[PDB]
Amino acid sequence: AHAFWSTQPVPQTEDETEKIVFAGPMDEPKTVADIPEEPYPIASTFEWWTPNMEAADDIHAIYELLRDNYVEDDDSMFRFNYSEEFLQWALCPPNYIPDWHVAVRRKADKKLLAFIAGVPVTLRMGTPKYMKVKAQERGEGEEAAKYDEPRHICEINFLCVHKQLREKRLAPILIKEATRRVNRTNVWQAVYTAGVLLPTPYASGQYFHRSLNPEKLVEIRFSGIPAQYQKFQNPMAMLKRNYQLPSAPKNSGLREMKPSDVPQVRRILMNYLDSFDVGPVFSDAEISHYLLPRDGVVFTYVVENDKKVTDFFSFYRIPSTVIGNSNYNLLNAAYVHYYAATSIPLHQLILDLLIVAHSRGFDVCNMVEILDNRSFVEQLKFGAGDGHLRYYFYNWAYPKIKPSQVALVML
Numbered sequence: 001a002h003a004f005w006s007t008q009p010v011p012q013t014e015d016e017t018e019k020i021v022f023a024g025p026m027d028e029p030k031t032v033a034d035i036p037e038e039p040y041p042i043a044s045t046f047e048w049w050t051p052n053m054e055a056a057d058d059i060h061a062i063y064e065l066l067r068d069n070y071v072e073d074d075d076s077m078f079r080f081n082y083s084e085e086f087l088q089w090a091l092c093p094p095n096y097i098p099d100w101h102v103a104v105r106r107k108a109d110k111k112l113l114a115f116i117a118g119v120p121v122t123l124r125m126g127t128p129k130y131m132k133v134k135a136q137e138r139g140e141g142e143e144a145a146k147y148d149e150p151r152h153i154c155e156i157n158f159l160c161v162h163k164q165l166r167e168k169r170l171a172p173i174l175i176k177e178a179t180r181r182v183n184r185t186n187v188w189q190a191v192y193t194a195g196v197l198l199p200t201p202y203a204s205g206q207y208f209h210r211s212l213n214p215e216k217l218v219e220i221r222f223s224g225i226p227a228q229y230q231k232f233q234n235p236m237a238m239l240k241r242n243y244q245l246p247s248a249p250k251n252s253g254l255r256e257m258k259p260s261d262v263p264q265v266r267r268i269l270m271n272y273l274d275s276f277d278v279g280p281v282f283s284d285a286e287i288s289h290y291l292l293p294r295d296g297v298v299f300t301y302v303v304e305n306d307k308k309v310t311d312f313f314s315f316y317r318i319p320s321t322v323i324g325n326s327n328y329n330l331l332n333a334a335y336v337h338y339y340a341a342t343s344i345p346l347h348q349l350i351l352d353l354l355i356v357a358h359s360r361g362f363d364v365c366n367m368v369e370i371l372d373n374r375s376f377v378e379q380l381k382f383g384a385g386d387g388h389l390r391y392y393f394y395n396w397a398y399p400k401i402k403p404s405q406v407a408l409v410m411l
């Protein structure tokens, strides 16, 4: 019984979602004129605040809110610690809209208490290929193709309410106010992810994790000793051997991506992403923004053969605070980002990612089974995680799809 989500333009049940066969909007059309001009009222001790993401002190305030109050694991042993440089990167892509970053602060002391972020993305979100096949059989190809044009929508992330203000219905008001500012911009759909189940995902993918420093991961209780290893005299020793990696990449031609690589990377990435049912469309400027190496934030390598870029991979860094371990205070996680392989098997491309990440000091490589990520899980010794990432749209009916038909990486 969802007091807020039952009022919203999202499919309300799995049964409803299972019956959706065409993509399109949920709400009847509205105009900007239909949308309230003023921010929603809130308690007189609080005020709305739009952070200036180009101000180091505002980024620092957001940083500290998220550091202390953002996503924790179920046992409260790890908490995301997105860096300030990461936040400026994720929040300020090309043509970002400052007003879509919505915060609540306390009037008296100006303390930041809650936050939600939206950024523009151009997303292909038309009817899935297989549903189009079936629709053509029924003579409904026109209906199924109606919304194939890429759409300029909002991607929502970083929803966060201070631990002190939880379960006080602040999150719905934040979501409503974000929806209002986005609607006032003449944007009517959003895409978001969450590790929890809400009404109603169009896709869900399990997390997988590739141990790079298994001794640390066991010590901090990220991982355990698999039971099969208890047959050994020194299980940890054999675990370290199992996960051992070469010290250098195996692909001749691998090097860091350069600005001059952007056009070729854009071409091979878009060729790949275009084969998925849901996926972003990136300009040169967005490829540069999201993939050019940034110290401590995003790491991107290309394979060059005969003076042509034929493959690339990227990963980004999010450390987690380790809560209450005597020997470690941080978990250094690399997350598989976008990639594209044309000259080599994908598992060989991602093996070099693991090797590079290990050599740059990362403890674990994480991913969700979107893109073709599932296809190399066994080959490269990823293990299944406890968590799933659910993909949602706001104001968009969408048929259920497998995560392997999703090509949008969420930071």
Ligand SMILES: CCCCCCCCCCCCCC(=O)SCCNC(=O)CCNC(=O)[C@H](O)C(C)(C)COP(=O)(O)OP(=O)(O)OC[C@H]1O[C@@H](n2cnc3c(N)ncnc32)[C@H](O)[C@@H]1OP(=O)(O)O
Pocket (backbone or CB within 6 Å): 001, 002, 003, 004, 005, 006, 069, 070, 071, 072, 154, 156, 157, 158, 159, 160, 161, 162, 165, 166, 167, 168, 169, 170, 171, 172, 175, 178, 179, 182, 183, 187, 188, 189, 190, 192, 193, 194, 195, 196, 198, 394, 395
């Ligand atoms: C066109 C433009 C549209 C733009 C908007 C598109 C939609 C965007 C939607 C948001 C996309 C976010 C994507 C991310 O960032 S996902 C990550 C979310 N953040 C965290 O998990 C950080 C740690 N947790 C918190 O900060 C709080 O617990 C949050 C803020 C999550 C809830 O605060 P609190 O614990 O103080 O609760 P409340 O009393 O204020 O509110 C209770 C209501 O909140 C619903 N709830 C709980 N968790 C989530 C969740 N993750 N997405 C959506 N709704 C959620 C819940 O079902 C209930 O509604 P209902 O069950 O009564 O109906």
